Symmetry: D2
Subunit: 338 residues, 4 copies
Amino acid sequence: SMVRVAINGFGRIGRNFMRCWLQRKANSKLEIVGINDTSDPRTNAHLLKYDSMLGIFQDAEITADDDCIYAGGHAVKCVSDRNPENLPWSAWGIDLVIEATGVFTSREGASKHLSAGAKKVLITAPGKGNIPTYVVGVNHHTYDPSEDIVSNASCTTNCLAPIVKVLHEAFGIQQGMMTTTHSYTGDQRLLDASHRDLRRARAAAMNIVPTSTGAAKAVGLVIPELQGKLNGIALRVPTPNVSVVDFVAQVEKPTIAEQVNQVIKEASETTMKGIIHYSELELVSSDYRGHNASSILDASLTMVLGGNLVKVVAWYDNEWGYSQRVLDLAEHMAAHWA
Amino acid sequence: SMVRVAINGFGRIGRNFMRCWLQRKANSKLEIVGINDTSDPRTNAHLLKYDSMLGIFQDAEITADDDCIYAGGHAVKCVSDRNPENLPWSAWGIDLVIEATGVFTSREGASKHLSAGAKKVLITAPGKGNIPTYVVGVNHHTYDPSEDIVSNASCTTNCLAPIVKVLHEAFGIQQGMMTTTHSYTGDQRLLDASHRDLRRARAAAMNIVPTSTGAAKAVGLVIPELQGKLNGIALRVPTPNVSVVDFVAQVEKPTIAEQVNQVIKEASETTMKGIIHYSELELVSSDYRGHNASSILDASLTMVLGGNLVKVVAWYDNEWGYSQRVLDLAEHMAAHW
Amino acid sequence: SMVRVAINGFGRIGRNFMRCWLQRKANSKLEIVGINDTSDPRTNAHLLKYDSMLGIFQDAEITADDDCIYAGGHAVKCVSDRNPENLPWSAWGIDLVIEATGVFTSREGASKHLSAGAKKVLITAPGKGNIPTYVVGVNHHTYDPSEDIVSNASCTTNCLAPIVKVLHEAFGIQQGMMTTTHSYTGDQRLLDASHRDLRRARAAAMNIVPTSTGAAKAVGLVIPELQGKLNGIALRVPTPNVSVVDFVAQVEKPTIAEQVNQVIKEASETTMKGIIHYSELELVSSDYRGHNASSILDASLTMVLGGNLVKVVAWYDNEWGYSQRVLDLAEHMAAHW
Amino acid sequence: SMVRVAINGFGRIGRNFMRCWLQRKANSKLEIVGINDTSDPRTNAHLLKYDSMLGIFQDAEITADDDCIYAGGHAVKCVSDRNPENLPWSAWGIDLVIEATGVFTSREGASKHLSAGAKKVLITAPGKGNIPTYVVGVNHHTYDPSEDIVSNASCTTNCLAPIVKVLHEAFGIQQGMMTTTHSYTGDQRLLDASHRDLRRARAAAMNIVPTSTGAAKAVGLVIPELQGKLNGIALRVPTPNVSVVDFVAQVEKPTIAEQVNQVIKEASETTMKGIIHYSELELVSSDYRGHNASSILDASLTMVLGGNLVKVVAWYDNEWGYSQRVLDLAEHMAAHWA
Ligand SMILES: NC(=O)c1ccc[n+]([C@@H]2O[C@H](COP(=O)([O-])OP(=O)(O)OC[C@H]3O[C@@H](n4cnc5c(N)ncnc54)[C@H](O)[C@@H]3O)[C@@H](O)[C@H]2O)c1
Ligand SMILES: NC(=O)c1ccc[n+]([C@@H]2O[C@H](COP(=O)([O-])OP(=O)(O)OC[C@H]3O[C@@H](n4cnc5c(N)ncnc54)[C@H](O)[C@@H]3O)[C@@H](O)[C@H]2O)c1
Ligand SMILES: NC(=O)c1ccc[n+]([C@@H]2O[C@H](COP(=O)([O-])OP(=O)(O)OC[C@H]3O[C@@H](n4cnc5c(N)ncnc54)[C@H](O)[C@@H]3O)[C@@H](O)[C@H]2O)c1
Ligand SMILES: NC(=O)c1ccc[n+]([C@@H]2O[C@H](COP(=O)([O-])OP(=O)(O)OC[C@H]3O[C@@H](n4cnc5c(N)ncnc54)[C@H](O)[C@@H]3O)[C@@H](O)[C@H]2O)c1
């Protein structure tokens, strides 16, 4: 029967994950039964229903009272405690925690859910220290059922890794540089304010803001042959969702743009179906809102020089497309549960 | 003889105040000697110098070490403690604390700076409970030197009150409604997230966000005859700075637009000089960045119906113009200490 | 028996109207058979389908060739001529032209479609000179079948008029002031550039831009008792769609907020059903995208002072909601042809 | 004595060029004596003074009447005719026309100023057909005084070329890929509307909008050895000014990031002084508003992989920094006038 899931942190990814699940609920081995977050159920039900990015939730009615959120008559219990050791995970029979607060990404932090009584934790971010990292359609079939804490990597990693995997197998990637032009996120400031990163301190909707990203090194964890071969940066720009990666590879087998495109297109129809989408259309970021693929290759931006320098460009919905992946990873753990 | 000032909360208002003071430093009875804020001096020196709104600070070099910010060789001591009772105000000889955190606006909260040793507190926001409230050019000459905690009201109140005072004296305001179309502030969320106010919870740069404001009631505290006669709302919109108030008054003496304009123009040249500016130009918000006035009356938007229903519209730089007024209030307290 | 419609100007309103019609196509007495626009059918089919505001059109497939757009197998003929006298309206048997270019709003301009052979014109904007003006749910039942050129007013007028009509009938409006805080439109510039209006010349997504509006005077054309009693302004702000009107009325019968709210709620359930929606929710602009009502009253912002000064605030999707009303006006003309 | 200049097209670049000149007026061999534009002098004086990006012009008073704009008592004559053959260039003794309309970039278009009586034209954009192209600090000393029509290339080309020139000379560029994350410009639409380019048709302040750029191929015109070796794209994003280029080169001489940085820094102090600025600061786009350099290298984003794959990142103020270059090219033509 059902794997009982709790969401810790009812943020952009927490609530996108909940909306993904509510739309895939008839096929699922998961049942979302609890939420912990720093605010109350009435606030959270309001935000779950009224989303500036996704619009008004249509499929089912959403209400709340002092201790539950109700979404189509399914009652989701709510609690509010910043310290996960205190959570009622044993009492609610929680099997799997979706860890989406952004502050419990190390094994020591995420373990406190295990102390509270949960059996497994899926971190919706890169892990700190050695937490196994999975990207669906790249390495998720290597999942080991005895693992109690996993990571679903970052949005950028989920866009980049499948593309790198297709190219590496067809051409042999020797080295690779990435830049993601990425929507701002809640980690940045609305107006100039203190932050650990002096660039992220700056008014996010007024600026182009460079920042580091672990996505390119993290690709080497999910494609171990490429460990150390990729590097990259991010530019945060004044859009609220939808991001784009630009990837430039030095490859071994000499090629041209038409063949790079053909190889990706062929993978998008077969081995990476549902993960990579191949687009020949002349679209912009708003058109990819709500797209279910991890990466949408923009085929007419592909270019190659001298045989060996290859550039591809791919879109991703960093909230929604990532949340669909978290749900897929979760369903996969549910189907291989021990 | 210099009044020693500490800034508590080195945010948009705290740092705007500091820049205002650094530019008026030769005339001043204040000396900023300390800052308390939740982050460190290097971060704060970087933010003081590199401002998305004001630009790069030009006049003087700004550096920092582990415990000071240096702004043109003037050393400003820094500490970092969330609880103001712990602050070293007696040890630094602090006379006046500029309370700019947004979280110590009641008397009980602001009094903790007095417990820590400061002699007076100027809150950069409306006071909760009865804290005397001053708007420079409206009632600051009623300031009483024995008051230990005061409020400089909100940016919106500083824009609205002087205009109300001029109109009330010329025409007799019986009732009035305000809407401010206001730049977003740090109090709102960048992307939809939890907040006390369900509207402020929503992505600030993507939405028009209505929200309540006490600015219209607060005008009744600084013009006591109008207590209970005014009300209003705010609309937060996707600009980072510069705001506009739209005020509709029911007045006693019948009038027309040209006369309403003339009365405010006259006050802008005499009693409200430096507080109200009168503009006949067709300008937009970005042209008011850095403006020193509390209100800039946009004269061609003035309209009157039926003699008695009067609408005026006025701009304000909610960060800079307000901070100039905090500095003026502070210099006034300094002069009457 | 179908009324054959051509769209002149396939802009934001033209394409919103087309999408509105494609979704209400089974109930309709209209058939859209032609489009004239300054660009070509492939470009226009791409823009019809891929909309930054409405999203990707889902219901039906949309394709194009050199001379038609196809939307669910329905073929819409396309031509491209700036001068409406040259248009092939007799050759296409056009009954009704939806005039959405923004440049043929006088009778002389709109009459050129009649010269070209159309039998009637519905202008998607206020008329210049005396063109009969209709607001659905306020005066559309006064439409006279012999009129050959009509106006559906502006988005702001469609939001304001129904609320004014309800309030006037319950309390007696003596005078009223409006400000609309309005999304930018294609009429403004992306970056500072030449324009007839020096304010609209300025970068629209960086500024609050005041501008005049005839919406408040135009309410007097559709509620003739209020002619000359209303005035207002607009503030354009950096959102791409969804607008809000703030209306302050001086009324004859003394009242309070709860009663003003109740009267509008009651009208929203009966006489203004589908035209005014009454909302008690704490929502922001992006939540009103796609709303079908002409006005959405935001009930908790309602305030009253002194019995007689009443403020209400109402939302409108200026592209979609307005286009639903153009379609309703058109269906009404169709039913009375 | 003075070269008499007219500005055709009083747009973002036309008015930025005018403000650059008003601030460098005491040193100059140019005198701006006329403007042609599609609107009137009162509108244009208003826009010259009140700028959403540059702020209120401070140095001098600016007024207008029916036929002049006055800027500090200097009277600039104004006319308004879309067709440059009709312009009064002989009657005003115009030597040099700054062609900033964006619509007269071919030799046939720009020549009509010569028919009207001007002696030379400087196009503030890439030329169409063979118009000599100059980038100050890369090839402007090759200027030939007998040329009657020239191009000052694009903003992106002025940022990229000097950097490519420094790298090519130190490491030998074999191939190179560029992406510019670029502020929107007046060429894009405010809300979705018809455009020759289906991506630029889309609401510029709401979208990330890919688009082609000739900047990378144009580098091969100013550095002829690299002709055919560079390619690239642009992403337009919702900021109104300030842009960033990300350049990834395959080089011949193996290197590391510290040495790439050192070479650029050394050029910024010597041969490219005033053209390339080397920044070690953690800044964002708004901080580079008004910067006079063509390219500001963001040194801590530099990275190298495998010796031969080099990535650098540089900022530019696409309006102001480009306009300073146009003024420099003009002053250079003035000092070598025939
Ligand atoms: N584009 C994206 O937004 C994106 C994509 C992929 C991964 N991620 C990652 O997902 C995680 C969450 O990101 P987000 O964008 O939802 O941020 P967010 O700030 O919207 O969500 C964080 C939520 O957790 C709550 N929270 C914080 N501390 C808590 C605690 N101690 N206990 C309970 N709740 C707490 C916050 O109030 C908020 O509701 C981060 O790790 C982020 O790196 C984000
Ligand atoms: N337009 C405006 O921004 C504006 C105008 C007028 C008045 N105000 C008022 O000024 C005050 C601050 O506004 P802001 O816009 O500067 O906010 P902000 O968040 O930018 O500034 C608050 C600063 O204080 C710090 N802080 C928070 N808690 C603290 C504590 N316990 N101890 C020390 N520092 C702490 C924050 O880290 C930040 O540096 C508020 O009362 C606000 O309502 C703001
Ligand atoms: N919020 C709104 O957008 C809104 C709301 C209500 C009413 N309106 C009114 O609707 C009308 C159009 O507004 P819009 O926002 O759709 O503008 P828009 O610029 O998007 O649309 C105008 C369309 O007509 C085309 N056009 C221009 N001249 C033409 C000609 N001579 N012949 C054929 N086509 C021509 C343009 O190329 C464009 O496709 C205006 O009268 C406007 O005031 C707009
Ligand atoms: N970032 C930038 O803005 C940038 C940087 C480098 C180069 N450029 C290039 O500079 C040129 C102008 O760009 P811009 O951003 O100033 O655009 P813009 O639209 O602001 O300026 C064009 C000006 O010329 C006017 N105009 C158009 N046709 C005309 C005609 N036939 N006669 C007279 N005036 C006419 C327009 O009204 C406008 O004032 C373009 O060629 C552009 O590619 C732009």
